[PDB]
Every structure is written in structure tokens, then in C-alpha cells.
Amino acid sequence: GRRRSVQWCTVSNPEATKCFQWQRNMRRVRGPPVSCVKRDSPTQCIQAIAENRADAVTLDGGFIYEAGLAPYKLRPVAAEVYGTERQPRTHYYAVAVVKKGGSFQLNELQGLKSCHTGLRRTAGWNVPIGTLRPFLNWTGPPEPIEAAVARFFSASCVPGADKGQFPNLCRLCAGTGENKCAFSSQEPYFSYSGAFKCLRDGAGDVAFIRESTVFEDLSDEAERDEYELLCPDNTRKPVDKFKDCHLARVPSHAVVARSVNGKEDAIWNLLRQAQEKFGKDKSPAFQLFGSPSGQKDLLFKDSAIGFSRVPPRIDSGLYLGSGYFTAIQNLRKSEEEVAARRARVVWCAVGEQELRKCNQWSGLSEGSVTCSSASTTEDCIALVLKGEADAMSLDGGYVYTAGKCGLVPVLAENYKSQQSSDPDPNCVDRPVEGYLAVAVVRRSDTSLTWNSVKGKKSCHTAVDRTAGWNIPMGLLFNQTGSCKFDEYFSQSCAPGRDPRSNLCALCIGDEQGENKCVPNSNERYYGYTGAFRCLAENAGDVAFVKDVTVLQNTDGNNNEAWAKDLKLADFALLCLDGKRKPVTEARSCHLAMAPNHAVVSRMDKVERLKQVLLHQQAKFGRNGSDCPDKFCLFQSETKNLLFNDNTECLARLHGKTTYEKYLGPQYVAGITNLKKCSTSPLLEACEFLRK
Numbered sequence: 205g206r207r208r209s210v211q212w213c214t215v216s217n218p219e220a221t222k223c224f225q226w227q228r229n230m231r232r233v234r235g236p237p238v239s240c241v242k243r244d245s246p247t248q249c250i251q252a253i254a255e256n257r258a259d260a261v262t263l264d265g266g267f268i269y270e271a272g273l274a275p276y277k278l279r280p281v282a283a284e285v286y287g288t289e290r291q292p293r294t295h296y297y298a299v300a301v302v303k304k305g306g307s308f309q310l311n312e313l314q315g316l317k318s319c320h321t322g323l324r325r326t327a328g329w330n331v332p333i334g335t336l337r338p339f340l341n342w343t344g345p346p347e348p349i350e351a352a353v354a355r356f357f358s359a360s361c362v363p364g365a366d367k368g369q370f371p372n373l374c375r376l377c378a379g380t381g382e383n384k385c386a387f388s389s390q391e392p393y394f395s396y397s398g399a400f401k402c403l404r405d406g407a408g409d410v411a412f413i414r415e416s417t418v419f420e421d422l423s424d425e426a427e428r429d430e431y432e433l434l435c436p437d438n439t440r441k442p443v444d445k446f447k448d449c450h451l452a453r454v455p456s457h458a459v460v461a462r463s464v465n466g467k468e469d470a471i472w473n474l475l476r477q478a479q480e481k482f483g484k485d486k487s488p489a490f491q492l493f494g495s496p497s498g499q500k501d502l503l504f505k506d507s508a509i510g511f512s513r514v515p516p517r518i519d520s521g522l523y524l525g526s527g528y529f530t531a532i533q534n535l536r537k538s539e540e541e542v543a544a545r546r547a548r549v550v551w552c553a554v555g556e557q558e559l560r561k562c563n564q565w566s567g568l569s570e571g572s573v574t575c576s577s578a579s580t581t582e583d584c585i586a587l588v589l590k591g592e593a594d595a596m597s598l599d600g601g602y603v604y605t606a607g608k609c610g611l612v613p614v615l616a617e618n619y620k621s622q623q624s625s626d627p628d629p630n631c632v633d634r635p636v637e638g639y640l641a642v643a644v645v646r647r648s649d650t651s652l653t654w655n656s657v658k659g660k661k662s663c664h665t666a667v668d669r670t671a672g673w674n675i676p677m678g679l680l681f682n683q684t685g686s687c688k689f690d691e692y693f694s695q696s697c698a699p700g701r702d703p704r705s706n707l708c709a710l711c712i713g714d715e716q717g718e719n720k721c722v723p724n725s726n727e728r729y730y731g732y733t734g735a736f737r738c739l740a741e742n743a744g745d746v747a748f749v750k751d752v753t754v755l756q757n758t759d760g761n762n763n764e765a766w767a768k769d770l771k772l773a774d775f776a777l778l779c780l781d782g783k784r785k786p787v788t789e790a791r792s793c794h795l796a797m798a799p800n801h802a803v804v805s806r807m808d809k810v811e812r813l814k815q816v817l818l819h820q821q822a823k824f825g826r827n828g829s830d831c832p833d834k835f836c837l838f839q840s841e842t843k844n845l846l847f848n849d850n851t852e853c854l855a856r857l858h859g860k861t862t863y864e865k866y867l868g869p870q871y872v873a874g875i876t877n878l879k880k881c882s883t884s885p886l887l888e889a890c891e892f893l894r895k
């Protein structure tokens with residue numbers, strides 16, 4: 205009984221009214237049902253929703269943040285759309301509006317009077333206070349940040365502030381008696397228009413609102429030129445140049461619901477129908493995005509032009525963006541705590557084995573490196589977007605996904621280069637050469653060739669990895685044209701695939717026999733080493749790995765049980781011409797050349813990450829002073845934990861600073877094509893956040 209009715213939570217009485225009208229028009233055109241619940245605040249609606257007593261509520265970014273925390277854990281499911289039909293946007297601008305006449309700039313606001321939309325709201329609080337922080341002389345956490353704002357502005361109106369504790373922040377508010385400084389429309393200086401009115405009336409000298417307000421409340425183009433914008437470059441510009449004069453670019457308000465049983469489908473269904481039937485100029489009888497004369501923004505932003513569905517993988521953190529998300533958090537931290545986080549590198553480990561090795565490295569980094577972890581690589585990418593993690597080394601296939609999500613390459617894993625050979629002094633500056641993706645089979649299976657590989661059993665490092673997937677499948681796909689990847693081979697072990705699929709049939713999970721097909725080291729057949737093992741133990745007939753994998757795991761080079769006796773001569777490669785050669789002849793018998801694995805991070809961490817890694821590798825690197833004695837980064841004994849064990853050093857990119865330039869035009873084209881057959885939820889999430 206999920207769609208019976210969607211229960212919208214209102215925060216005020218006039219809002220309740222509108223919610224009721226909407227209820228009847230939905231019952232007058234025979235659309236999905238909607239019922240209304242009352243409360244007196246966002247927080248209450250947030251609680252109402254988590255306690256199964258309501259289904260949805262529209263919130264500003266600031267409360268999207270609160271709603272995603274601990275008890276509640278709600279998620280955005282639908283964003284508001286603004287702009288025009290020709291150029292829609294699911295974001296808006298936080299600006300600072302002043303009157304034409306004064307001469308003061310953004311850095312000269314000390315002692316002036318301010319007008320805010322409400323405490324903890326995006327444009328009215330979070331952004332302006334985050335931006336002015338260097339001028340506040342705030343000492344940190346015991347002392348609330350409000351207190352410091354109270355001394356900076358001689359007087360303000362900050363709806364919802366504790367007027368008993370911060371009287372200065374309620375001074376200019378126009379509410380009557382108990383409605384003075386109330387977080388509701390009872391306070392006339394509340395929200396975007398309220399804060400703007402506070403400016404027009406001359407009560408305050410500056411207003412912190414959004415870019416559209418001045419245009420929504422002032423019809424006469426003439427009255428608009430009496431106002432200007434404060435730009436962060438300490439200049440003033442017309443209110444129409446907000447694209448070039450804003451404090452921040454922020455995500456649009458969004459409808460939230462619970463993560464578990466939210467009734468997302470029901471919510472989305474109601475909205476879409478509501479939007480079609482009552483959107484901008486659809487029916488005079490009702491305006492979903494319109495509000496009564498003396499009222500503003502009831503249930504939704506007036507003049508919003510529709511909704512855009514938010515992808516499933518997105519949670520509150522991802523929605524807000526790394527900048528804004530971590531900016532909120534920093535408002536509750538001291539400048540020393542913030543600068544310390546800025547100085548440290550948080551690594552993401554994929555799996556307990558990687559976390560273990562990571563912890564060991566951390567305990568020896570003199571405070572420069574710490575750890576975090578997830579069970580998949582994609583989940584680790586998400587933590588880097590949320591700022592909970594900063595870096596990790598990825599196969600080229602994941603560098604694609606990471607790039608489409610806005611991350612960038614910093615350094616690459618350099619491997620024992622072609623015999624220019626000798627422990628290279630300038631390894632860090634030696635251009636990368638990529639590696640060789642090959643197809644490996646047992647020497648005895650004499651009939652097996654590239655032309656007859658289809659239909660047999662296959663072993664892959666993991667889905668979406670270069671040598672293990674993108675290259676093999678890409679070649680096959682280029683022939684048939686089928687998107688049915690699970691029919692290319694009878695059975696396989698392709699970690700990260702659907703467990704009940706054939707692509708998981710040969711996988712064997714951990715020693716206990718659990719985690720079958722999981723994309724991390726617990727699956728014994730995972731990665732370069734795991735896919736080889738899959739072949740050597742006779743599970744599959746061909747393994748898609750790199751040439752050095754076979755070398756590093758035969759002739760006693762790996763003294764583990766399954767591999768102790770394997771010999772290099774018991775294996776051969778399948779060449780694209782139908783022939784077969786020994787592993788030692790991979791330069792003339794490979795499927796393609798793959799880009800070196802690379803370390804990725806957010807743009808704001810590149811410099812710091814780089815100096816740390818360079819330092820760390822000089823200590824624990826290949827010729828690391830303290831390598832054998834204490835710790836070696838590039839060693840883990842064929843498990844390839846955190847980095848490939850054959851990494852000589854982490855080297856510079858020489859200008860290839862974007863994933864497109866680093867991966868190359870051909871390889872990117874290749875993956876893009878493969879992606880038409882299916883995309884990951886993460887890839888879907890990032891397409892949405894980049895729009």
C-alpha cells in the first residue's frame with residue numbers, strides 16, 4: 205500500500221491551505237492522491253517523515269543536510285528546476301544585494317546592518333557566513349559561530365536565531381511580539397523576499413539572497429537599477445551580471461523522503477502529474493508554483509518551472525557537492541581543525557586487506573596519511589566526491605568513471621619500463637609506457653585460438669577494468685554488435701557482476717566460500733592475480749590479464765600453494781591473427797596497450813597530495829630508505845594491495861592532467877561505446893550532478 209496516498213508535510217497554516225487545494229484538484233482531474241499533515245517547522249517535518257507519519261517535504265540545501273544526518277537519514281528524490289524552459293537549471297546563485305549609492309565592498313561589511321533569509325539556509329546563512337569567516341576573528345567550537353556574527357554586524361535579522369542568546373541577530377527583524385525573529389512567514393523579513401524587503405525598507409545595508417529575487421519582486425526595470433551586487437573580488441556590478449558576481453553556485457531545493465520505504469515511485473508519479481496538469485500556466489484554478497498575494501514560496505519555490513528526478517545512488521552528501529557539503533561541516537570547526545584536514549591525505553581502501561595495509565602505512569606517515577574504506581571501487585569514488593576520502597590508485601577503466609564524476613589524475617604508477625633498464629634515477633620523470641593486455645590459455649588446449657574463444661569459460665579481473673573487461677569485450681562487441689555480454693561466454697568469473705548471472709558462475713568467493721563475485725580481494729579470483737588463478741585451477745579456459753601477471757606467478761615467483769609449481773611454459777597467448785605464442789612474446793601478441801593505473805583526487809587536493817606522495821615514496825618506495833626494514837608501499841606479495849606490486853615509482857603526468865588526455869581519444873571512445881549497453885548507477889548519478 206505504497207501509493208495509496210503521498211503525505212505532504214506542511215510547515216505553516218497557509219501552506220496547509222495550499223496543500224488542501226492541491227489535494228482536491230488532484231481529485232478533480234483524477235490524478236494521484238495527496239494528503240496533508242501539519243507541523244510548525246522543517247525539523248518537525250523531517251522528524252514526521254522519518255517516523256512514518258508523512259512522506260515528503262521540500263527543503264533548502266541547508267536542511268537537506270540536516271535531514272540526511274543520523275536519526276533521519278532522508279534523501280532527496282526530486283529537485284526543483286529553475287531558469288526558463290529554454291535553459292533550465294537545477295542550481296541557483298547565492299548573492300549579496302546592496303543599494304546603489306554606498307561605496308563599501310564585500311570586505312568592508314564590518315559594523316553594517318544585514319538581512320538574512322533564515323538561520324542555516326543556504327543563501328541566507330551557510331554561504332555568506334562561510335565567505336566572511338576570515339573577517340570574524342571567531343576562535344572556534346565552544347563559542348557558537350552566531351556569537352561572532354553578532355559582534356561583526358551592528359544589527360541584523362536572522363530568522364530562527366536564539367534571540368535570548370543573540371539579540372543582535374533579531375534586532376532588525378519586523379515580527380510582532382513573539383513572531384519577532386520567527387522562522388516562519390509570521391516574520392515579514394523571512395525567506396528570500398523577506399530579506400529583500402528588509403533591504404528596501406532600509407532596515408539593513410546588505411541582503412543575502414538568491415539571484416532571482418530582485419527580478420521577482422521588482423517589475424519596473426527602472427527600480428532594479430537602484431540595486432547592485434557585491435562581488436567576491438571586492439567590486440560591485442549590476443544585478444543582471446550575477447553569473448560573474450556571486451558568492452556561490454548551489455544546488456536547488458529538493459523534495460526529500462526516507463531512504464528505506466520512501467515510496468519514491470509514488471512521490472515522483474504525483475509530482476510529474478502535478479507538474480503536467482498545474483505547472484507554469486496550465487490551469488487558472490491552481491498554480492503548483494504560485495502563492496497567494498501576501499504569501500511566498502508555499503510548498504515549492506514560486507516560479508520554479510518543474511521537477512527533475514534524482515538518481516538512486518545519490519544521498520544528501522553527494523547531492524550537495526563536495527564544496528558545499530564540506531563547507532557546511534566546517535562551520536562547526538576551528539580554523540586549526542580545518543587546516544589540519546586540508547593538510548592530511550585520506551586514502552580509500554577497497555576491502556579489509558587493503559584497509560589493513562593502509563593502516564600500517566598510516567601509523568608511519570607522521571600524520572600525513574589516514575584511511576577510509578568501502579567494499580567496491582565505485583563506493584570509494586563516492587567517498588571522494590563527499591570529501592570523506594581524498595585519493596586512491598585506479599585502473600584506467602575506473603579513471604573513466606572517476607573523470608566523468610569530475611576527479612582528475614595526479615600521478616601514475618610507472619612500471620619497470622622496456623629494457624631502458626636499471627633502477628632508474630629519474631623514474632619520477634620518465635614518461636609512462638602503458639602495459640600490455642593479453643589473453644592467456646593453457647598450452648595443452650591446442651585447439652583454442654582467438655577465433656574460437658567465444659562460447660568457452662572466461663576469467664576476468666573485474667567488470668569495467670581495462671585488461672579484464674573493456675579491452676576483451678570491446679573487441680568482441682565490435683564484431684557481433686550484441687549488448688548481451690552474458691552470452692559471449694558460457695560461464696565466467698567477472699567480479700562486480702550480478703551474482704545470479706553466468707558471469708559469476710566460476711567465481712569462488714573467500715576461503716569460507718562467501719563474497720562470491722564481489723569486486724575486492726576477498727574474492728579469490730579477483731584482479732590480475734585472481735583471474736590468472738582462475739585459469740591455472742582449470743575453472744576457465746582463458747584469462748584476461750596483463751603479461752607480467754603470468755611471469756610474477758609462475759616458476760616459483762609466487763610460493764603460494766595454488767601457484768608453487770606452475771611453469772611459464774605451460775601457458776600461451778592468443779594473438780589477434782589467430783596464432784598463439786609464448787608469454788615472452790607478448791610485444792607481438794597482445795590485444796591492446798592499456799594506460800598505466802593512476803592516482804586520482806579532487807581538484808582542490810592535487811598539490812598537497814602530490815608533495816605527500818613524493819615524500820612518502822622516497823621513504824617507503826622501491827629504493828625507499830626505510831623500505832625492507834620498516835615498510836614498502838609497492839609490496840604486498842602478489843596481492844597488489846593499494847598499488848600494483850610491480851610499480852617502480854609514482855610518476856608525473858607531463859601535462860595529461862584530465863582523464864581524456866590521460867586515457868587517450870581512442871580508449872575513451874571505446875568505453876563510451878560499451879557504456880551504451882548499460883551504465884552504472886554512479887555514472888548516472890554523476891551525469892546528473894554535472895548538468
Ligand SMILES: *[C@@H]1O[C@H](CO)[C@@H](O[C@@H]2O[C@H](CO)[C@@H](O)[C@H](O)[C@H]2NC(C)=O)[C@H](O)[C@H]1NC(C)=O
Nearest residue numbers: 314315338339340341342352353354355356357
Ligand atoms: C577582529 O580583529 C581585528 C584585528 O584582529 C580587530 O581590528 C582592529 O582593526 C581596527 C582598524 O585598524 C582597529 O580599530 C583596532 O585597533 C584593530 N586591532 C587592534 C590593534 O586593537 C577587530 O576589531 C576585530 N573584530 C571583532 C572582534 O569583531
Ligand SMILES: *[C@@H]1O[C@H](CO)[C@@H](O[C@@H]2O[C@H](CO)[C@@H](O)[C@H](O)[C@H]2NC(C)=O)[C@H](O)[C@H]1NC(C)=O
Nearest residue numbers: 678679680681682683684685686870874877878
Ligand atoms: C571495428 O573495428 C574496425 C577497425 O578499426 C573499425 O574499422 C573501420 O571502419 C571503417 C568504415 O567501414 C573503414 O573505412 C575503416 O577502414 C575500418 N578501419 C580499419 C582499421 O580497417 C570498424 O569500423 C569497427 N566498429 C564497428 C562496430 O564495426
Ligand SMILES: [Fe+3]
Nearest residue numbers: 264265326327
Ligand atoms: Fe535556498
Ligand SMILES: [Fe+3]
Nearest residue numbers: 599600670671
Ligand atoms: Fe589494469
